[model samples]
Structure formats: C-alpha cells, structure tokens
Target: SGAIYVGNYRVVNRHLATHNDWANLVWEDSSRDLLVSSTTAQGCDTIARCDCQTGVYYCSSRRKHYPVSFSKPSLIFVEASEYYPARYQSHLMLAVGHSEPGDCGGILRCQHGVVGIVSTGGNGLVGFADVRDLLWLDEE
Candidate 1:
C-alpha cells in the first residue's frame, strides 16, 4: 500500500457519511463551508474546513498544505475494507472526494493515521499538512 491508501473505492451512497470518522459537524457561515471535527494523533481535535467557493482547505494542525485548485468533495462512511479491493483497504479509509487527486497519490500517509497533503501528482511544492480525518460537507 506504500502507506497511502489509493484505490477505486466507490461512494455507494451518502447515508454513510457520519458512520465513521466520528466528529461534531460545524458550518462556517462566513465562508459557506463545512467543517468536520476529528481528533488528531496529537495536540487537539482540529477543525478541517473546505472552502465552498475555492475548494481550498484550512487546518490548524497537521502538516498538509492544499492547492488552489482543490474542489468539491463527498463523504464516505464505509470503512476502507468494504469498498476498497483487498490489499488496498486500511484500518481507516474514508474517501472524501469522487475526483479528488488524493485518490491518486496527491496525498501521502504520515505518522499515525494522519496523511500528508501534497499537491497533485505527489508534488511536494504545496507542502504537507497532517489531518486525521477526511471531511466533506453535505451538498445542500
């Protein structure tokens, strides 16, 4: 797996959004965005916010740096095992975007279950931001 869980896992439905990666949901009115509350391996449970307008991301902890072209994402509740083919599953695998580059090495697994957010094509120019959970907002 190379520490990164990249696969063709499909989003069967949206009902599973809140099944795993448990967190208190919050909405950022100022940015018209959605935030997922998750506990990181260190520090405190951080808020991962996705900008509705630009799809850029913001996180206080971890080492993932997002790019300007990042865009809309979906929530996947099924554990990595259910959808991912054998050998591609993990203890925790939440596919947050249908077309997210992270599905193809845009992101890398870091210490613990955290992932290092890199630019598309494994480019490190964007820097690395560590986030424990992959949070995506409801399309409403």
Candidate 2:
C-alpha cells in the first residue's frame, strides 16, 4: 500500500505562506499546476494536479500511480485555526485533492516557492501546516 506518511513532523492547519526563505503559492495563469514533493527519505513520492478538477498522482516507492478527484480551487485567505495551538495566520490552498490518507509533513510548492505542508482541510479542502517551522529545525 502507498499509505506512508509524508514527513518527519507536522505544523497542523494554515497553508504555509512566504515564511523565512520560502515563497508563497501564486497562480500565474489557469494551469494551476502544483507540486507535492516528498519521500526521498521514505519513498520517491510526488503529486500533481491539473485543470483544477482531476488528474494523476504517483507514489514512487510502491510505484502506485493514481487518478485523483479534485474540487476546483481558488486561493482564499484564512485565519489561524483556533484548536491546533500553532497560531500562524495563513491560508489553505483550498482544494479537494486526495493522497489516500497518508499526508502529514510534506511541502506544497508552486513556481514561486513553498506554500505549505500536507494537511487536512477543515471540511475537506486539503490545506496544510507550517513551512517556516520545518525550516526552523536548523541546528545551532
């Protein structure tokens, strides 16, 4: 099964914004092409979206390429999640994509820079957690 978690830890809620060294996810045009890079430590995992509705995804460790169903997404500004404790003002790349229940700490990216982590949307949007927190793990 391709049910492996994405990263070492999680930030929980709020699509990562232009934090520290990373940039924000921006829509250049209608392609809405996004990237989910993960799994060099666990698996050669990467995800993709196209047309904003449906596309193919892949988990290279098991080599499970899959077809994902999606909801049309538009970038929306969001407030900090009240319950998770990490109060960082951010947004969820509000989407309805799928990775079959194994997303936790991977970075979602755009051509500009990093967007956020792999997190569950409040209802179903697939928005995620902190990018700066992950990078802050630098050794002193």
| Best of the candidates, TM-score | 2
Q: In candidate 1, what are the lDDT values of residues 23-112, reduced to their tens digit? A: 432321111111233323323222333232223332223334332443233222222223232221111222223322333323333223
Cα deviation of 25 in candidate 1 (Å)? 19
Off by over 4 Å in 2: 1-91, 122-124, 130-140
* TM-score between candidate 2 and the true structure: 0.30
Candidate 1: where are CA atoms >4 Å away?
1-42, 53-66, 75-83, 86-140
Alpha-carbon RMSD of each model: 13.8, 11.4
Please report, as a residue range, the 10-residue window in candidate 1 with the lowest summed lDDT: 6-15
Worst 10 residues of 2 by lDDT: 25-34
Candidate 2 per-residue lDDT over residues 1-140, each given as its tens digit: 11212342212222222242123221111111122222224432222322333333343323353344433344444434432333333323444544323443344544333344444444444543323223322221
What TM-score do all the candidates reach, one by one? 0.21, 0.30
Backbone clashes for every candidate come to 8, 1
Clashing pairs in 2: 39-43
